[PDB]
Amino acid sequence: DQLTEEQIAEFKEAFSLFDKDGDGTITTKELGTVMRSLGQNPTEAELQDMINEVDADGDGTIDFPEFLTMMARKMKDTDSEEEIREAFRVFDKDGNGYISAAELRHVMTNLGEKLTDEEVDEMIREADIDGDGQVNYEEFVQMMTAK
Numbered sequence: 001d002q003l004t005e006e007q008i009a010e011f012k013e014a015f016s017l018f019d020k021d022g023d024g025t026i027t028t029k030e031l032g033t034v035m036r037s038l039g040q041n042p043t044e045a046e047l048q049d050m051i052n053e054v055d056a057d058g059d060g061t062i063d064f065p066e067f068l069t070m071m072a073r074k075m076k077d078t079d080s081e082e083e084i085r086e087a088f089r090v091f092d093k094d095g096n097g098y099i100s101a102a103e104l105r106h107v108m109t110n111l112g113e114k115l116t117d118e119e120v121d122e123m124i125r126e127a128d129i130d131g132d133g134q135v136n137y138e139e140f141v142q143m144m145t146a147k
């Protein structure tokens, strides 16, 4: 019961990356494309269940308001313990305990945002507390709790 301007901004950014055609609806093809690039393999039946969960009007696809609710369930309900480690493994593929600028940029590119290499290195230094030029799991959760 509030809804901030920053909140809507975060959702809108994610929604634009999902909807490749920007028609306002997310099909199983679009939803599956994002998850497939994140190192996951969800089937047609699996992707459909995700859409039906937030299907307010039951049109078969994910609309703008339906997507807002979907993100509110994961980013504002779940993800506390044994769930952040799974997300960390998505960025750090080799699992060395450190997320380099190359790994972060790779995941972002798969999402849809093809940022520059220099921009990603600026993000790394932001979460870099020990000054090693990388982001470990300890620094990952630290930045995940902050803006």
Ligand SMILES: [Ca+2]
Residues within 6 Å of the ligand: 019, 020, 021, 022, 023, 024, 025, 026, 027, 030
């Ligand atoms: Ca679409």
Ligand SMILES: [Ca+2]
Residues within 6 Å of the ligand: 092, 093, 094, 095, 096, 097, 098, 099, 100, 103
């Ligand atoms: Ca690594």
Ligand SMILES: [Ca+2]
Residues within 6 Å of the ligand: 127, 128, 129, 130, 131, 132, 133, 134, 135, 136, 139
């Ligand atoms: Ca570090």
Ligand SMILES: [La+3]
Residues within 6 Å of the ligand: 055, 056, 057, 058, 059, 060, 061, 062, 063, 066
């Ligand atoms: La819908």
